[PDB]
């Protein structure tokens, strides 16, 4: 009968904890028996504490709650009401695999160890001796692999997957900006382990707020310690633009890159998208390999999408490769 | 008026007739039970006070016939717009740099109104009491409504309406709801009785 | 407009209270001033004569001064290159003043609110009027020293109001003749002549580098507590090392003693000083067996 002393709470204790309880943000904790609380008004209140409360969320001062008539620290602030509601802590994963990336294979192999292998087989390293490396940069030309594809596939066989972008990093109003990456590497740090994406950092459009912001992804990356803070994966189109302070092969570890396609991935990456389609009689490479004298990774995505759509305006799931030509002149000409 | 709205019960003797959604109505001390609706107590009608003629305005002819066209003519000839089809334009925005025809044309409009030309300078919409102002400017709008036909003239809006606000410390947490419900108040008068909101500002 | 109290339920004014303000102005109440006398300052003695003549001589001889019939001089602005003897002349002059004194900083006067920066300089001069006769030291005017300009989108007007209310309880209307001012700025080109109206801030006294003799004097000053050998020569310690602004010379002594105990001896020598220098700057640069 271990559940006998639980019901004394709702007749001797919940009479104290269970009223129009108020919520005011906690302040500098004077030692055990008390605390000070600035309430919702702004009036400080030297409150007491509770004996039975299992106090673990004392940090001067997350929104603690109080009693109405008497003043105390009655409960705590589960239902945290998470700042950065929409940062994509992925629960429903997207639709990319090891197979549909299918092109650059060296690269997805290298990022596959550099993010995934301290998770899918972490018992290489301490048996071998080395530390696991930190996050990569993976720069490239535009459309050369969807830079944000070999990180997306690094999503869907791991734990949590936190991202950022150059746009969430910079700020208008701010004057006070480098806060975003304070609590981005504080929320990022908290999951243990989560991967933070500095999606396309390229910082263009005074200047000194951008300077201090870059200095705080810099320092807030590697100041004094780190939790499981692999995933700092940076996609970039302009590697020669950003200040070479990020890479002290400490702040940014080992990093992997690629030529745009070759023709082998013009074929092999062309036949992934149109594998979903229904064209079969004259699937070609003469209109694909030397057609544009190198066509992006996307231009084939847009040639499949604009191809099937342009043969879908006239309502047929048929195989016409002359409509494909109207798709070519339609999308890039 | 003491800060918040909060729930009530209204007595049976008052009829459910005059309770418009901005009707100033009385409550009971220590109870807050509704008791009686009130006349629109709030701003001045400006009885015959400003005096420059529309004949010594000088030069201004096309602006004078546009403001003559879209303000006092749809208050007098309110139905000819309902005999052709084009609506009377609701507001009048006057942007003048650096200021030539602002406030003698809005001063010589005030003679031959035969209409409640209520003035308010757009700078006491902010008050030291928190959450005061929106109630103030909706008192201004209904004070033009029960005095129709009226011409609301609010100056230098960029005092109360700008492009750039501040989510933190509340110097402008209330002026983003001075503008907001005024912006909701003007949409509440598309039934077109007679209230015309002309407004001026040095720079737009 | 005074500060008069009242009952909390009956609301009738019982007694008066003398006028008040925050403790952020009442924090400027230094009592521990004299430990840096006029002997520790060295090599600047015409600036000591000029400043001390300009400040504490109207504190003890005004009437004789009034018998000449000329106005008491206003605030003194001290200025110099990076770090000479500004604040040491501040607490050296405030050391042996026998008055009251307030150590008002530059950036204490600029805060996030509109009211606070302005309210506290006027109440600072109100404190100085109430407790007068007192002199006021404003350290580092570069806080309120960025000046008026044709200001489009961003600008700044908060520091403008703090400064422009500072210089009008300074040389606005008449009642000035109670409280003297001392200023100290490491930069002067940042300042508009509003803060230089010949009267707002009298004698703009120059702080140079300490000259050829003065650094030997300062190396004798600071090294007064250390056990120095009789076989020492401060003059060659001066004439060898001539770019320093007097602050480094203080150091030269102190980490000269530090490496003197890094050797482990309880008594320092000349090459401790001489070898102590090759430490103030250093910046490496080896592989020089070729500088002949």
């Amino acid at each position: 009968p271990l559940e006998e002393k639980q019901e004394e709470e709702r007749s001797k204790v919940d009479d104290l904890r269970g009223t129009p309880m108020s919520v005011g943000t906690l302040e500098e904790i004077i030692d055990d028996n008390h605390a000070i609380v600035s309430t919702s008004v702004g009036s400080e209140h030297y409150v007491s504490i509770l004996s039975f409360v299992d106090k673990d969320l004392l940090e001067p001062g997350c929104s603690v709650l109080l009693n109405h008539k008497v003043h105390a620290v009655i409960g705590v602030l589960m239902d945290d009401t998470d700042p950065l509601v929409t940062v994509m802590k992925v629960e429903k994963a997207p639709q990319e695999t090891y197979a549909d990336i299918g092109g650059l294979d060296n690269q997805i192999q290298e990022i596959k160890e550099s993010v995934e292998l301290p998770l899918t087989h972490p018992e290489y390293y301490e048996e071998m001796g080395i530390k696991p490396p930190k996050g990569v940069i993976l720069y490239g030309p535009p459309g050369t692999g969807k830079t944000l594809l070999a990180k997306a596939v690094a999503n869907q066989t791991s734990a949590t997957f936190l991202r950022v972008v150059g746009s969430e990093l910079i700020q208008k109003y701010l004057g006070d900006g480098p806060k975003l990456v304070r609590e981005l590497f504080r929320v990022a740090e908290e999951h243990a382990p989560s991967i933070v994406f500095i999606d396309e950092i390229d910082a263009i459009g005074g200047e000194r707020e951008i300077q201090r912001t870059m200095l705080e992804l810099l320092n807030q990356l590697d100041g004094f310690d780190s939790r499981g803070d692999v995933k700092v994966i940076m996609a970039t189109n302009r590697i020669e633009t950003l200040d070479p302070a990020l890479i002290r092969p400490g702040r940014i570890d080992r990093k992997i890159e690629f030529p745009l396609p070759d023709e082998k991935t013009k074929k092999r990456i062309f036949q992934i998208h149109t594998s979903r389609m229904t064209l079969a009689d004259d699937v070609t490479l003469d209109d694909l390999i030397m057609a544009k004298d190198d066509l992006s990774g996307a231009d084939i995505k847009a040639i499949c999408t604009e191809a099937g759509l342009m043969a879908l305006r006239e309502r047929r799931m048929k195989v016409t490769n002359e409509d494909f030509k109207k798709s070519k002149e339609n999308v890039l000409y | 008026t003491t800060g918040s709205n909060y729930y009530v019960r209204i007595l049976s003797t008052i009829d459910r007739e005059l309770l418009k959604p901005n009707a100033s109505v009385a409550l009971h001390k220590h109870s807050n039970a509704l008791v009686d609706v009130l006349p629109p107590e709030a701003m001045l009608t400006s009885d015959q006070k400003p005096d420059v003629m529309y004949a010594d305005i000088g030069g201004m002819d096309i602006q004078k016939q546009e403001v003559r066209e879209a303000v006092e003519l749809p208050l007098t000839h309110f139905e000819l717009y309902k005999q052709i089809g084009i609506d009377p334009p609701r507001g009048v925005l006057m942007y003048g740099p650096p200021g030539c025809g602002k406030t003698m044309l809005a001063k010589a409009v005030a003679h031959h109104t035969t209409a409640a030309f209520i003035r308010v300078v757009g700078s006491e919409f902010v008050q030291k009491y928190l959450g005061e102002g929106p109630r103030m400017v909706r008192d201004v709008f209904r004070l033009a409504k029960e005095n129709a036909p009226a011409i609301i003239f609010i100056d230098e809006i960029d005092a109360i309406a700008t492009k750039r606000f501040d989510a933190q410390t509340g110097a402008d947490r209330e002026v983003q709801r001075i503008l907001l419900e005024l912006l909701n108040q003007m949409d509440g008068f598309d039934q077109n009785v007679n209230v015309k909101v002309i407004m001026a500002t040095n720079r737009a | 407009g005074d500060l008069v109290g009242v009952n909390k339920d009956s609301y009738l004014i019982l007694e008066t209270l003398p006028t008040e303000y925050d403790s952020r102005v009442k924090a400027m109440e230094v009592d521990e001033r004299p430990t840096e006398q006029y002997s520790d300052i060295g090599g600047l003695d015409k600036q000591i004569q000029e400043l001390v003549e300009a400040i504490v001589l109207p504190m003890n001889h005004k009437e004789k001064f009034e018998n000449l019939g000329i106005q008491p001089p206003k605030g003194v602005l001290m200025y110099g290159p990076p770090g000479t003897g500004k604040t040491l002349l501040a607490r050296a002059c405030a050391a042996q003043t026998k008055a009251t004194f307030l150590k008002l900083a530059g950036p204490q006067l600029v805060q996030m609110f509109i009211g606070d920066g302005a309210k506290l300089v006027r109440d600072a001069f109100a404190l100085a009027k109430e407790k007068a006769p007192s002199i006021i030291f404003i350290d580092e005017l570069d806080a309120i020293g960025t000046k008026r300009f044709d200001s489009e989108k961003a600008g700044d007007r908060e520091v403008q109001r703090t400064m422009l209310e500072l210089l009008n309880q300074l040389d606005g209307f008449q009642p000035n003749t109670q409280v003297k001012v001392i200023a100290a700025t490491n930069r002067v080109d940042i300042l508009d002549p509003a803060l230089l109206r010949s009267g707002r801030l009298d004698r703009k006294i120059e702080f140079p580098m300490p000259n050829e003799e003065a650094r030997a004097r300062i190396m004798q000053i600071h090294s007064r507590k250390m056990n120095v050998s009789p076989d020492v020569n401060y003059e060659e310690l001066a004439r060898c090392t001539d770019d320093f602004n007097g602050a480094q010379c203080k150091a030269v002594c102190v980490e000269a003693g530090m490496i003197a105990l890094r050797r482990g001896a309880t008594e320092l020598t000349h090459e401790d000083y001489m070898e102590g220098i090759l430490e103030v700057q250093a910046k490496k640069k080896a592989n020089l067996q070729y500088y002949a």
């Binding site: 302040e27 400080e44 490396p133 002290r248 | - | -």
Partner: protein, 347 residues
């Protein structure tokens, strides 16, 4: 779990700001009417002064408890706590410019008998120059690893918050809680985030940053018995930091973490060869003379990278041609974009 009987004798208490004493004194609740009140029964008249804050009850509005000052946003800075695990035996490749740093940071220790003995006051400031490859901070983690003191890390953009004058509020507040702890110190990481030496009065853009920095160098030396805050500051950038900051008094004994030479650089991979289960005979000094002007805090990318080659080639050991395969990979192929001659010009 049974504090019901004691809650009624607690008296929930409102903090108010005390001021002048006529006796009587004036409190200020910051939401109420700043009114006049005396002491209760037991608190000393010399225990309560101006400026500080005391707690007031709500029943008859009177003071019982004197209370500590407020530090609201800089609570997290503080002296970190615990501290990382690297130490003096880890950060290798310098051997003397530790000892310059060591004798300044380690005088609440043994050392004060030497300094009150032969009349020295120790230097307060330490400055740490280097290109962004050396253990500019790693030494900061070592002096945080053993300190016998506080450790207030405060990095260079917890100060740049965008109300004017407010960044100067956090700095003076930082030195307010710094003086309320004997034998304390502080660390300003990345101080070139407050630089831009002292600009014009035209399009003034740095000005707010300026005054934060300005009150910083008012606290580093002005009108105080100063306590003993052994400040030590580490940035990768010379004179963007103006004078009156580098000048001895607030940052003497600057340390130049230059790129290590042929002798020392062996030693730093000797730090990172404390792992990896390497081959029987391996030529370390070869691996010094193949990289030879890299940077101290990289050779760990040679370490980690060659271990990545060894795990890739399913070997339990590490040969020479994966070391030599690695120095081909992170010296030759990773010098195209990665630049430390750009900061070596800056020094």
């Amino acid at each position: 779990a049974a504090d019901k009987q004691t809650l009624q004798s607690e008296q929930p208490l409102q903090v108010a700001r005390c001021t002048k004493i006529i006796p009587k004194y004036i409190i200020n609740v910051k939401q109420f009417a700043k009114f006049v009140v005396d002491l209760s029964d037991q608190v000393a008249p010399t225990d309560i002064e101006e400026g500080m804050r005391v707690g007031v009850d709500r029943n008859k509005y009177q003071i019982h408890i004197p209370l500590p000052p407020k530090i609201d946003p800089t609570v997290t800075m503080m002296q970190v706590e615990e501290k990382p695990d690297v130490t003096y035996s880890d950060v290798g490749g310098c051997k003397e410019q530790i000892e310059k740093l060591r004798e300044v940071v380690e005088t609440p220790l043994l050392h004060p008998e030497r300094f009150v003995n032969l009349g020295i006051e120790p230097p307060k400031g330490v400055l740490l120059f280097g290109p962004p490859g050396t253990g500019k901070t790693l030494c900061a983690r070592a002096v945080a690893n053993r300190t016998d003191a506080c450790f207030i890390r405060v990095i260079g953009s917890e100060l740049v918050q965008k109300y004017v004058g407010e960044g100067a509020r956090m700095v003076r507040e930082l030195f307010e809680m710094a003086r309320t702890k004997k034998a304390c110190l502080i660390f300003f990481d990345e101080i070139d985030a407050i630089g831009g030496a002292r600009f014009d009065d035209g399009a003034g853009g740095d000005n707010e940053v300026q005054r934060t920095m300005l009150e910083l160098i008012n606290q580093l030396d002005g009108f105080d018995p100063r306590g003993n805050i052994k400040v030590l500051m580490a940035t990768n950038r010379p004179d963007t930091l103006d004078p009156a900051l580098m000048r001895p008094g607030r940052l003497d004994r600057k340390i130049e973490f230059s790129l290590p030479d042929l002798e020392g650089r062996t030693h730093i991979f000797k730090i990172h060869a404390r792992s990896m289960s390497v081959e029987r005979d391996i030529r370390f000094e070869l691996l010094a003379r193949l990289c030879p002007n890299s940077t101290g805090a990289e050779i760990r990318s040679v370490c980690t990278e060659a271990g990545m080659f060894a795990i890739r080639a399913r070997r339990k050991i590490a040969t020479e041609k994966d070391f030599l395969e690695a120095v081909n990979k992170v010296i030759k192929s990773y010098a195209k974009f990665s630049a430390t001659p750009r900061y070596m010009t800056y020094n």
